[PDB]
């Protein structure tokens, strides 16, 4: 029963924009029971029926998943204007957070984020769901010690893509692993984007030349080794997400010790 009464929803300030409409933060109210912070996806052209079924298929996608580190679907409002109500990640996007809290985040917290995400990505792997859009822009922050993948609906990213995805549009879990590799780099770089000033066309020639993103300052050797394994040109030599989870677990413990 995912159908929600509109009167239980209070719309608040706008937090972003999707292909279908604006995203708002708001409150979901309930007798008893305080008040739940939620993200509310809206829909400018949900007037038509084709657009409505495209918009709602996004709700359906999230409903398939139940994981601590993936944003949860709360419900839908299926009269006009059609709304999808997601759980809120109060602290916002990962990139803005890393740039702002650059000087109050120890290396231990950045590794935590990379691990948490990898648990989520291992879950999606075990379900055989290929994300295709793993990038820091798409990670959200619930609290200081908790990141989550945002709505897949709201998420070509040439600079993030595996070679075989670029060259042959083959998107698989091993291509997700590459993308995750890029993402771990963004995190360690405190929200800096890969291949700054480099045009999307220059990207692939450089990846085939062997060029990989540099080791971030202060990045522990073993973690960058793992990143370089995510960027094995041949996708069968790349480690699976369950492998990454067990390595990021030991790496993190090692750093929680310093
Ligand atoms: C305070 O709550 C906020 C505020 C600002 C952003 C996010 C946020 N928390 C959310 N909590 C849950 C959800 Cl489902 C959510 N939805 C998003 C809300 C916003 C975004 N953004 C994508 C990046 C956008 N922006 C970032 C840099 C400037 C240009 C592009 C604008 C924000 C995203 C969202 C998402 O799921 N993905 C994958 C990206 N936001």
Numbering used by the authors: 414 to 568, 584 to 686
From the paper:
Focal Adhesion Kinase (FAK) is a non-receptor tyrosine kinase that regulates signals involved in cell proliferation, migration and survival. FAK activation is initiated by breaking an intramolecular autoinhibitory interaction between the N-terminal FERM (4.1, ezrin, radixin, moesin homology) and kinase domains. All compounds exhibit a common 5-chloro-2-ortho-methoxyanilino-4-anilinopyrimidine core structure, which binds in a nearly identical manner to the hinge region of the FAK kinase.
The carbonyl within the isoindoline moieties of TAF089 and TAF672 superimpose well with the carbonyl in TAE226 and induce a similar helical turn at the DFG motif. The morpholine (TAE226), methylpiperazine (TAF089), dipiperidine (TAF672) or methylaminopyrrolidine (AZW592) moieties in para position to the amine groups of the aniline rings make almost no protein contacts, consistent with their incorporation for improved pharmacokinetic properties of the respective compounds. IC50 values for TAF672 could not be reliably determined because of its low solubility in DMSO and aqueous buffers, however, it can be expected to mirror the potency of TAF089 since the moiety that interacts with the FAK kinase is identical for both inhibitors.
